[PDB]
Amino acid sequence: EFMHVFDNNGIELKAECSIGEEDGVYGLILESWGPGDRNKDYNIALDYIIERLVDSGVSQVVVYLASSSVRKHMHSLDERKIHPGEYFTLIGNSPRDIRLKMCGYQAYFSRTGRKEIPSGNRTKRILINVPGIYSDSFWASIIRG
DNA sequence: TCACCGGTTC
DNA sequence: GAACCGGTGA
């Protein structure tokens, strides 16, 4: 029932995902890491996603916090956008460093709202959008490798 | 039961 | 500061 991200050798990572419309936004949803080994390749899978997006000519994305808790308590889609600007930038650093910047923003959320000081888990359920892309074929290529 | 993220371990 | 564990409330 869940799709997965595949590594550069075509091996399936422990990283559940799905492609579709959620809260009016079309994109890739990467499921959360935890407990234990549930989706433990979150970070590697997300590194590949960023790298492959860049190789496909995508320089900017929009990333929403999409955990059941945050969706429940933060009704505003604009507030659920993890980064302060309109877009998040995928170029100018290594895919790893870009991920660190991206996932640092997840630390500003709690169960019920935003925080002052970022803390806690950074590997939560997120929705990545590429502006102008409404196609599962594109996203299929990105997660397949 | 399950995905949630707080909080400890790296 | 980031990776990971596992306790938690629904």
Author numbering: -1 to 143
Manuscript excerpt for this entry:
The enzyme consists of a novel N-terminal specificity domain that we term NEco, and a C-terminal catalytic HNH domain. We determined the crystal structures of NEco in complex with fully modified DNA containing three variants of the Y5mCGR EcoKMcrA target sequence: C5mCGG, T5mCGA and T5hmCGA. The structures show that monomeric NEco has two separate pockets for (hydroxy)methyl groups on cytosines, reachable without nucleotide flipping, and reveal the mechanistic basis for the Y5(h)mCGR sequence specificity of EcoKMcrA.
The purified NEco was co-crystallized with 10mer dsDNA with the central C5mCGG, T5mCGA and T5hmCGA sequences. When Y is a cytosine, the N4 atom of the C is about 3.3 Å away from peptide bond between G32 and P33. This distance would be suitable for an NH–π hydrogen bond. The C5mCGG sequence used before for in vivo and in vitro characterization of EcoKMcrA and NEco exhibited ∼7-fold weaker binding. In the EMSA experiment, stable complexes were only observed with the C5mCGG sequence containing oligoduplexes. The binding pocket for the (hydroxy)methyl group in the proximal strand is a locally hydrophobic region, formed by the Cβ atom of S30 and a part of K122 (atoms Cα, Cβ and Cγ). The protein-DNA complexes in the three NEco structures are highly similar (all atom rmsd between 0.3 and 0.9 Å).
